[PDB]
Symmetry: C2
Subunit: 101 residues, 2 copies
Amino acid sequence: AMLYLEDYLEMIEQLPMDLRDRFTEMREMDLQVQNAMDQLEQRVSEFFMNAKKNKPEWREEQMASIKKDYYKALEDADEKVQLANQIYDLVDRHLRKLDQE
Amino acid sequence: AMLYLEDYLEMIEQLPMDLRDRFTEMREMDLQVQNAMDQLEQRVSEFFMNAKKNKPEWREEQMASIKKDYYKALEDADEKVQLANQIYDLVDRHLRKL
């Protein structure tokens, strides 16, 4: 409980700001993705809800917004992908450093 | 107060079955992502902490486990991605029907 957090806390501190920052950065990115998907889900059930109501040209604005949200999330996930690559190479670099030492 | 949650109820219930399940699968995958990230961080820091103290073998073992967790994670992110694409397909199909 509280002691496991101390150990968890402990663990994080022995990690160069290099890595820790990219992890929380990935954290934030994942949060962003979840949020984008939420607004998409809402756009979608409104599509199904109103639908014929508010005319059928409502699909234009709606579907455009759906595509926008979806693309946004995709870009955010591609960004987490980049960040994980970064963390990967930064592992490798700190590694090699220690090995020839 | 929780009107946000009754509204989300009515929200969800407007979706067809396919779409609902893909979204809930997605949420499951998010959780799994958060755990993979977590676990990976922990092996990384622990490996740094105990890097110099332990033997070459221990370094190689921790590194293999780290690599695991990494690819692990990476796979989950792809599945979440994949789910999002399925959802978008189902959506524009439910439009092409109308």
